Amino acid sequence: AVQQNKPTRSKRGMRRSHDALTAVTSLSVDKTSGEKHLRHHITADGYYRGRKVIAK
Amino acid sequence: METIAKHRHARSSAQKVRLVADLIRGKKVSQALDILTYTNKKAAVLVKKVLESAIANAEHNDGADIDDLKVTKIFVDEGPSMKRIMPRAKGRADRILKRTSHITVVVSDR
Amino acid sequence: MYAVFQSGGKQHRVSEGQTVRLEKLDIATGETVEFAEVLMIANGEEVKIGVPFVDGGVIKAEVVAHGRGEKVKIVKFRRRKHYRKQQGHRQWFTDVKITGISA
Amino acid sequence: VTGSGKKPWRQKGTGRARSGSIKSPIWRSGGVTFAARPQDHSQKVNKKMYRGALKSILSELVRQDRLIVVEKFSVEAPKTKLLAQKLKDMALEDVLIITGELDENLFLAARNLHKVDVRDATGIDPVSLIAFDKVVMTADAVKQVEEMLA
Amino acid sequence: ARVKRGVIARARHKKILKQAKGYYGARSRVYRVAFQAVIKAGQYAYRDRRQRKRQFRQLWIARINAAARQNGISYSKFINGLKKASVEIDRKILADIAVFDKVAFTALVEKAKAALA
Amino acid sequence: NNRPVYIPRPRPPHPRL
Amino acid sequence: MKTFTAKPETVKRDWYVVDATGKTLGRLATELARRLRGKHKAEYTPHVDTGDYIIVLNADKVAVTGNKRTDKVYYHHTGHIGGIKQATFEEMIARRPERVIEIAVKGMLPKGPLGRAMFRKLKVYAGNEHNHAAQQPQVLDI
RNA sequence: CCCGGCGAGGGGAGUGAAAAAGAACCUGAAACCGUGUACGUACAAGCAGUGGGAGCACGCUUAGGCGUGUGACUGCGUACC
RNA sequence: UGUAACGGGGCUAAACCAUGCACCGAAGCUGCGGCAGCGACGCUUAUGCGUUGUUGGGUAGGGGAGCGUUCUGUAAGCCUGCGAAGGUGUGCUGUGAGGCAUGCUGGAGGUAUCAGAAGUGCGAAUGCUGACAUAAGUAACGAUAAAGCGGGUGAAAAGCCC
């Protein structure tokens, strides 16, 4: 239930090797406005597949 | 050029912010900015603000042409910690550490 | 073209015109020393020692330095018996360069 | 040490070392295992031993020519300038003036001179003789020395 | 006359840690563990100053034995022949000769064989 | 840093007699 | 001066062929271990693999004296509740005749990374043919 | 003056002998936590060192080694009180 | 629990008996270099020895000789803003505790030699105080009465206002 010896910083880093995040690196450019956005997501201004969908 | 920029005493823990820092290390500012824009972490907006400040410092206090800038160095160091008392069961007491950190970003054109 | 000789209780194989380090000798740093106790002389032709120390073979050598060796730390420790001891040692050595090897 | 004799915690059950008082020497802010007390460091020296050392010191000063005997040594007025001049022509800078009779005129002249001391034969100590480079004794001062030394 | 031991204590700890340089983990960082590591290294160094002499002796014998057998004689026979022939070359030179000068070793084994016969 | 003012009182689950 | 030490890069390793027909298993194996370790060379170094590549042919024709042909038993454990398995000399020969020779050499070599490295030089074949003719494998009589 | 939320924090400018003296302020050690560089490490078993030791990377005179760092492989070796 | 009653491989001699000659094998003995104690003698006579013999594993413990730290005198002397103490590296040096010179930070104190006095040396005492690790970015975020959407404000709204 509790450790008998404190794990080293080496073991701590080895366990943490799998905690690294991954960049999206998949930013698409809108057909009309040419705004970078996440794939299959509306742009910040409210564009998707060229046509405006939010109108706000 | 050096054009360092740092944000000291960030409330986020050094460990948590350090994951975001490793993402953009060695990359160009243009790719770094939108990488942080679409990273779903609180540390993302802390680091992004520091990176924006570094770019502004280079543009104003140093040479222009920020298009060819890169994040040569970025590191997160543990800062002062605040000690708090949190009651537990059976009348026991334990210490809660509100860990802070310093985020330092260095950009250069070479 | 090399010879084998006994100098300080341990034998050395030295070629012509090379520096060899050996135990301290009672010789000043600027005097030639003789080694007539030549165990073996080697050349294109081979000559051995029917009797030890050949027959007339000698080696001419010049003293160069009389320094001390690297410090060695001697540690004696008895486990659980409250006994620890420290010591240091620097062995004296003599650098000598072989000037000539006879036949 | 200011405090109370109450035990910090119970003898048993607590997970930490047994403690008896907040004032134990191995505790912060209170302790000192062997506290010092005001004591007298003066030690006894036999009268003969004191006299013998003084005789030994005087002899060696004569041997090293560090002792100069002269006639009456006095200053006409209580002025340090006069005393400085009198010692300047004698090539003396660190001297202990020993006179048979203590006169306020000589006492005041040497008061502001650090390197110069004025003393009487009765008030003579071994340290002063050793410390000072040169010792000047008047004829009267010399006589009282044998009488007291015997 | 209170005496503070901060300066002296820090000097002693630095000296031990300097000697513990290169060790792994706390053995090179923590004094309590470094002191044990340094002491143990001292014991091993003293012990291995004697094992080195015997370790090299074994290596020379193995080299001579391989060279002598390549010439057609066992190590024990070869050494016995040298003693009979009154040859005072030690193992260190014999191993050195075998590695570098094959002809010189061939003369030695030939001399040893003659003495035995 | 601070001695727990309260020390819980345990029990003997196992007589071990 | 410093004793000579063989440098692994500058080591020449030869290729030999040993016919294992009518040869005592242990005595043949003992010789193979000596060659693989390199102890037969005047530049032998314990921490360097100075040995030579050895090809063994006709493994299934190896001979054993006495009743070892039927009494010799090879045990190996599979790391399970009761996974202890034993095979006699005949059973091993029928299944994999080369393994017995490899097992004999395996136990006659040092244990460690260097011991495994020199064991990889040995190449045991059951038949009389080998596909290593490109290595100039000179015949070794022993 | 500039980035930032008329923030926090920071980069310039200026003051000063000094701002890694900026008020979280003299000196600023250790544990502990990081970034960079060199070397080693994904078929190898254990007080993690010690003896031997190739290779690699840096410098030195010489052109062979000497030093510094790392250290494959290998003998011996079960902490302290 | 797994061969598990040669240490293993393996051995029909690599087993056992008898004889013999070789070799390996320790910090034992010898060779070479160095240090220290003790007893003698030739001679120095408060010390080297042209020397001689021997000794030098060690707990409890006894005896001898030293290193370093703070303070007092020596010392209103000496070193020091062309840089003290402290900190951090490097290179020499002594059988040892240590010492010396110096690169960078530091910024104004330090102290020879010879004597004197000790709050004079820390790795342990479930030691005391402060700081920082570990488990670990893990458990948990405190009644299973429950939230959804639109608008507003705002740098940012599931929690604020309507």
mmCIF file of C-alpha atoms in Angstrom, chain D:
data_model
loop_
_atom_site.group_PDB
_atom_site.id
_atom_site.type_symbol
_atom_site.label_atom_id
_atom_site.label_comp_id
_atom_site.label_asym_id
_atom_site.label_seq_id
_atom_site.Cartn_x
_atom_site.Cartn_y
_atom_site.Cartn_z
ATOM 1 C CA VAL D 1 15.527 28.974 30.589
ATOM 2 C CA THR D 2 12.077 30.558 30.586
ATOM 3 C CA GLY D 3 9.404 27.945 29.981
ATOM 4 C CA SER D 4 7.367 25.243 31.674
ATOM 5 C CA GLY D 5 8.083 21.695 32.780
ATOM 6 C CA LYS D 6 5.070 20.219 30.991
ATOM 7 C CA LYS D 7 5.929 17.304 28.736
ATOM 8 C CA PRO D 8 5.498 18.384 25.087
ATOM 9 C CA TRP D 9 3.612 15.159 24.352
ATOM 10 C CA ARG D 10 2.770 11.804 25.883
ATOM 11 C CA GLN D 11 5.496 9.219 26.436
ATOM 12 C CA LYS D 12 3.828 6.561 24.266
ATOM 13 C CA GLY D 13 1.638 6.442 21.170
ATOM 14 C CA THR D 14 3.174 9.456 19.470
ATOM 15 C CA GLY D 15 5.216 8.491 16.439
ATOM 16 C CA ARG D 16 8.154 10.777 17.267
ATOM 17 C CA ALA D 17 11.032 10.770 19.728
ATOM 18 C CA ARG D 18 10.474 10.763 23.473
ATOM 19 C CA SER D 19 10.652 14.286 24.898
ATOM 20 C CA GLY D 20 10.631 15.530 28.468
ATOM 21 C CA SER D 21 10.700 19.316 28.323
ATOM 22 C CA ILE D 22 10.797 22.224 25.892
ATOM 23 C CA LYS D 23 14.055 23.338 27.550
ATOM 24 C CA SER D 24 16.182 20.294 26.732
ATOM 25 C CA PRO D 25 19.650 21.195 25.389
ATOM 26 C CA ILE D 26 19.022 19.287 22.138
ATOM 27 C CA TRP D 27 16.030 21.539 21.429
ATOM 28 C CA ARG D 28 15.961 24.861 19.621
ATOM 29 C CA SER D 29 15.508 28.038 21.662
ATOM 30 C CA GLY D 30 16.583 26.799 25.080
ATOM 31 C CA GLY D 31 19.423 24.665 26.332
ATOM 32 C CA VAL D 32 23.193 25.021 26.686
ATOM 33 C CA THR D 33 24.251 21.759 28.312
ATOM 34 C CA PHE D 34 27.093 23.224 30.413
ATOM 35 C CA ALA D 35 26.275 26.894 30.872
ATOM 36 C CA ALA D 36 29.180 29.096 31.887
ATOM 37 C CA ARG D 37 29.159 30.952 35.197
ATOM 38 C CA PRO D 38 31.118 34.020 36.349
ATOM 39 C CA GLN D 39 34.483 32.681 37.490
ATOM 40 C CA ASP D 40 37.816 34.043 38.690
ATOM 41 C CA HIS D 41 40.736 33.137 36.425
ATOM 42 C CA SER D 42 43.422 34.587 38.700
ATOM 43 C CA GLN D 43 46.023 32.017 39.746
ATOM 44 C CA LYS D 44 48.460 31.934 42.645
ATOM 45 C CA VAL D 45 52.130 32.747 42.094
ATOM 46 C CA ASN D 46 54.625 32.362 44.923
ATOM 47 C CA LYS D 47 56.321 35.511 46.180
ATOM 48 C CA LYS D 48 59.772 34.060 45.510
ATOM 49 C CA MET D 49 58.716 32.898 42.045
ATOM 50 C CA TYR D 50 57.444 36.393 41.253
ATOM 51 C CA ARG D 51 60.682 37.936 42.523
ATOM 52 C CA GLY D 52 62.794 35.387 40.666
ATOM 53 C CA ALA D 53 61.033 36.050 37.372
ATOM 54 C CA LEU D 54 61.417 39.796 37.876
ATOM 55 C CA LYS D 55 65.126 39.381 38.624
ATOM 56 C CA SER D 56 65.485 37.157 35.562
ATOM 57 C CA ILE D 57 63.731 39.716 33.358
ATOM 58 C CA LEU D 58 65.830 42.651 34.572
ATOM 59 C CA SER D 59 69.106 40.802 34.004
ATOM 60 C CA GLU D 60 68.271 39.945 30.401
ATOM 61 C CA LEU D 61 67.175 43.502 29.605
ATOM 62 C CA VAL D 62 70.642 44.606 30.703
ATOM 63 C CA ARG D 63 72.169 41.832 28.595
ATOM 64 C CA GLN D 64 70.224 42.919 25.500
ATOM 65 C CA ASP D 65 71.111 46.569 26.339
ATOM 66 C CA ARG D 66 67.371 47.343 26.377
ATOM 67 C CA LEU D 67 67.706 48.994 29.815
ATOM 68 C CA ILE D 68 69.165 52.504 30.061
ATOM 69 C CA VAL D 69 70.068 54.102 33.397
ATOM 70 C CA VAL D 70 70.273 57.903 33.536
ATOM 71 C CA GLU D 71 70.111 60.707 36.091
ATOM 72 C CA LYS D 72 66.900 62.444 37.152
ATOM 73 C CA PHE D 73 64.358 62.518 34.309
ATOM 74 C CA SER D 74 61.971 65.468 34.544
ATOM 75 C CA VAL D 75 60.086 67.978 32.398
ATOM 76 C CA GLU D 76 59.934 71.655 33.325
ATOM 77 C CA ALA D 77 56.292 72.100 32.284
ATOM 78 C CA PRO D 78 53.323 69.733 31.779
ATOM 79 C CA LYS D 79 53.556 69.754 27.982
ATOM 80 C CA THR D 80 53.550 66.663 25.784
ATOM 81 C CA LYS D 81 55.545 68.596 23.179
ATOM 82 C CA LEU D 82 58.481 68.966 25.573
ATOM 83 C CA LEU D 83 58.464 65.258 26.428
ATOM 84 C CA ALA D 84 58.352 64.327 22.743
ATOM 85 C CA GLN D 85 61.391 66.513 22.055
ATOM 86 C CA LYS D 86 63.277 65.056 25.021
ATOM 87 C CA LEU D 87 62.680 61.521 23.738
ATOM 88 C CA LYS D 88 63.323 62.452 20.094
ATOM 89 C CA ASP D 89 66.977 63.424 20.525
ATOM 90 C CA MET D 90 67.545 60.205 22.507
ATOM 91 C CA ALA D 91 66.292 58.054 19.593
ATOM 92 C CA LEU D 92 63.569 56.512 21.771
ATOM 93 C CA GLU D 93 59.974 55.996 20.631
ATOM 94 C CA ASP D 94 58.618 53.114 22.757
ATOM 95 C CA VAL D 95 59.983 53.591 26.278
ATOM 96 C CA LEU D 96 58.860 52.816 29.832
ATOM 97 C CA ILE D 97 59.982 55.595 32.178
ATOM 98 C CA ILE D 98 60.560 54.323 35.728
ATOM 99 C CA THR D 99 61.204 56.985 38.370
ATOM 100 C CA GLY D 100 61.688 56.723 42.112
ATOM 101 C CA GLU D 101 59.181 59.499 42.827
ATOM 102 C CA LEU D 102 56.027 60.046 40.772
ATOM 103 C CA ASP D 103 55.537 63.689 39.772
ATOM 104 C CA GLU D 104 52.332 64.958 38.190
ATOM 105 C CA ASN D 105 54.387 66.970 35.693
ATOM 106 C CA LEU D 106 55.918 63.865 34.117
ATOM 107 C CA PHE D 107 52.682 61.900 34.508
ATOM 108 C CA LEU D 108 50.650 64.448 32.538
ATOM 109 C CA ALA D 109 53.296 64.891 29.835
ATOM 110 C CA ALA D 110 53.267 61.190 28.911
ATOM 111 C CA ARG D 111 49.516 60.682 29.360
ATOM 112 C CA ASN D 112 48.718 61.349 25.694
ATOM 113 C CA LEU D 113 51.802 59.470 24.453
ATOM 114 C CA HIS D 114 50.735 55.903 23.703
ATOM 115 C CA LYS D 115 54.243 54.553 23.091
ATOM 116 C CA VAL D 116 55.538 56.196 26.297
ATOM 117 C CA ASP D 117 54.656 55.055 29.811
ATOM 118 C CA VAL D 118 55.571 56.621 33.153
ATOM 119 C CA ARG D 119 55.697 54.413 36.231
ATOM 120 C CA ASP D 120 57.063 54.167 39.757
ATOM 121 C CA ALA D 121 59.437 51.516 41.064
ATOM 122 C CA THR D 122 56.777 50.097 43.387
ATOM 123 C CA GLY D 123 54.268 49.760 40.554
ATOM 124 C CA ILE D 124 56.397 47.557 38.296
ATOM 125 C CA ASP D 125 54.980 44.488 36.565
ATOM 126 C CA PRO D 126 56.667 41.813 34.432
ATOM 127 C CA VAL D 127 54.416 42.365 31.415
ATOM 128 C CA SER D 128 55.286 46.054 31.129
ATOM 129 C CA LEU D 129 59.026 45.346 31.223
ATOM 130 C CA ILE D 130 58.743 42.634 28.567
ATOM 131 C CA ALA D 131 56.314 44.515 26.335
ATOM 132 C CA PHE D 132 58.171 47.818 26.103
ATOM 133 C CA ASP D 133 61.107 47.983 23.704
ATOM 134 C CA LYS D 134 63.228 50.194 25.985
ATOM 135 C CA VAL D 135 63.178 50.814 29.738
ATOM 136 C CA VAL D 136 64.692 53.961 31.256
ATOM 137 C CA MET D 137 65.378 53.885 34.997
ATOM 138 C CA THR D 138 66.452 56.855 37.093
ATOM 139 C CA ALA D 139 69.217 56.571 39.667
ATOM 140 C CA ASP D 140 66.675 56.776 42.489
ATOM 141 C CA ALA D 141 64.382 54.306 40.726
ATOM 142 C CA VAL D 142 67.240 51.814 40.477
ATOM 143 C CA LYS D 143 67.989 51.973 44.205
ATOM 144 C CA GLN D 144 64.435 51.175 45.305
ATOM 145 C CA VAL D 145 64.438 48.113 43.039
ATOM 146 C CA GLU D 146 67.180 46.283 44.943
ATOM 147 C CA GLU D 147 65.582 47.186 48.273
ATOM 148 C CA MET D 148 62.217 45.724 47.259
ATOM 149 C CA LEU D 149 63.742 42.840 45.295
ATOM 150 C CA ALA D 150 66.262 42.143 48.075
#
